[PDB]
Amino acid sequence: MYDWFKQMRKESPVYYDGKVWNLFKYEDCKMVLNDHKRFSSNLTGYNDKLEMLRSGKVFFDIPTRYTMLTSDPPLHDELRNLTADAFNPSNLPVDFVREVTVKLLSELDEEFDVIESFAIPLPILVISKMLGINPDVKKVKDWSDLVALRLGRADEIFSIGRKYLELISFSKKELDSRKGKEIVDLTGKIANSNLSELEKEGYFILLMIAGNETTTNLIGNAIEDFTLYNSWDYVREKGALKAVEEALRFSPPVMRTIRVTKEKVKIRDQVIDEGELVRVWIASANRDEEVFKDPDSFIPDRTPNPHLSFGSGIHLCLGAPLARLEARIALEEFAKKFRVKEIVKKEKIDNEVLNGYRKLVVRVERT
């Protein structure tokens, strides 16, 4: 995928495939992501039916159509601000994370799968913690793949199956709980808000899932990258702050984004009429020669590192501060306790916009 980008970065930054536009240039990308006035995120008719929905009307539709993720201002501000200050560094359960993470490694054997044994649990253990719920890790993971693994796939991203209704009823049940208030759970806040009934169900599923899957991929990626390019030592003594950041740029969980135009736009020599999709490639951007010196090299201490892994602008991953945190503690405790001796085998997540491993086996020996 990267050779293509490098090529597209040179030959054609603003490319039009069959029906969607594509940007591979950092500059073009960043600008577009910060231009919510023209490049909108209203891709599910969320804003459109905000009046109809708030009027109390109720129609059947997958709750995932209505998340702040696909909403434009000012509705966005309204949805994001409700639980935005909960994900600020100061309000992060840094303790919980460290304790659940340390336990997570308490008995790791000589050859285990870091994904299904560490990468998957932590995210879900934590987001649910903040979420104020606590179900089956396998259950949540199932619901996550169900939602994520259908990303990018043109229509199977709005379709409802049986196991999906299980996700819907789950949210409805959990939600119904928290009302009566005395808020404590992030879920708590959600239920008791002016939001329409299904908006609540969308916001709920949005934090539970958008949390873990991408967060797990980041740690799986980091572990490989840190091994392939030998960065473990550096981690043990200097920390994981800058490294965690290199992982993001070099091996991003979210390979790209998409947006629609509200007016005619002209990015470079290419004009784009309104009502068109614009695939914003974060991965390509992260490797742009114009912005990163020796971009195709992995540098744990690489700085500056203005990657677009978490996005940019007003939709900048709301869980960004939490992920870096979870990322840092998992890798340092892992780096502290273990010493990777080799990457035995690995299976990639079958998805084109989610860069990650579903299984990553490693041989190790305790310090």
Query: Using CB under 5 A as the criterion, which residues of the chain lie in contact with Cl ion when the complex forms?
Result: 161-162
Dihedral of CA atoms 257, 261, 265, 270 in degrees, nearest 10, equals 50
The site that binds ligand HEM (CB under 6 A) totals a number of residues, namely 24
161 binding partner (options ligand HEM, Cl ion, none; Cβ < 5 to 8 Å by kind): Cl ion
Does 302 carry a binding-site annotation?
no
Interface pattern 21-40 for ligand HEM (x via CB under 6 A): ------------x-------
Identify residue 249 by its one-letter amino acid code. R
Residue in the block written with tokens 């796939």: 153
- By CB under 6 A, name the one of 128, 214, 221, 286 that touches ligand HEM: 214
Using rule CB under 6 A, residue 222 touches ligand HEM: no
| Per-residue burial over 20-35, b = 16 or more CB atoms within 10 Å of its CB, e = otherwise | ebbbbbbebbbebbeb
- Alpha-carbon Rg of the chain, whole angstroms? 21
Does 328 carry a binding-site annotation?
no
Give, in degrees to the nearest 5, the angle at Cα 247 between 344 and 94.
100
68 binding partner (options Cl ion, ligand HEM, none; Cβ < 5 to 8 Å by kind): ligand HEM
What is the distance between the terminal CA atoms of the chain, rounded to a whole angstrom?
36
Closest alpha carbon to 163 in 190, 187, 189, 144: 144
Using rule CB under 6 A, residue 279 touches ligand HEM: no
Please spell the DSSP secondary structure of 177-221, one letter per residue. HHTT----SHHHHHHSSS--HHHHHHHHHHHHHHHHHHHHHHHHH
Residues 6+ away with beta carbon under 8 Å from 38: 261, 262, 263, 265
Stretch that binds ligand HEM, among 3-11, 238-246, 309-317, 345-353 (CB under 6 A): 309-317
Which residues within the stretch 74-93 sit at the binding site for ligand HEM (CB under 6 A)? 80
Using rule CB under 6 A, residue 196 touches ligand HEM: no
Tokens linked to 189:
């806040």
- By CB under 6 A, name the one of 64, 231, 257, 284 that touches ligand HEM: 257
231 binding partner (options ligand HEM, Cl ion, none; Cβ < 5 to 8 Å by kind): none
State the Cα–Cα distance between residues 166 and 174, nearest whole angstrom. Answer: 12
Tokens linked to 89:
């560094």
Question: Are the CB atoms for 318 and 44 separated by under 8 Å?
Answer: no
CA max distance for the chain: 61
Residues 6+ away with beta carbon under 8 Å from 290: 25, 26, 27
Q: State the nearest-atom distance from the C-beta of 59 to Cl ion, in Å.
A: 21
Does 76 carry a binding-site annotation?
yes
Q: State the nearest-atom distance from the C-beta of 198 to Cl ion, in Å.
A: 21
Dihedral of CA atoms 350, 355, 358, 361 in degrees, nearest 10, equals 130
| Nearer CB in complex with ligand HEM: 29/364 | 29
Q: State the nearest-atom distance from the C-beta of 251 to ligand HEM, in Å.
A: 10
| Nearer CB in complex with ligand HEM: 93/239 | 93
Interface pattern 44-73 for ligand HEM (x via CB under 6 A): ------------------------xx----
Does 317 carry a binding-site annotation?
yes
Interface pattern 319-338 for ligand HEM (x via CB under 6 A): x--xx---------------
Question: Are the CB atoms for 354 and 257 separated by under 8 Å?
Answer: no
340 binding partner (options ligand HEM, Cl ion, none; Cβ < 5 to 8 Å by kind): none
218 binding partner (options Cl ion, ligand HEM, none; Cβ < 5 to 8 Å by kind): ligand HEM
Interface residues with ligand HEM (CB under 6 A) are: 33, 68-69, 80, 127, 206-207, 210-211, 214-215, 218, 253-254, 257, 309-311, 315, 317-319, 322-323
Binding-site residue positions: 76, 80, 257, 259, 315, 317
Binding-site residue positions for heme: 76, 80, 257, 259, 315, 317
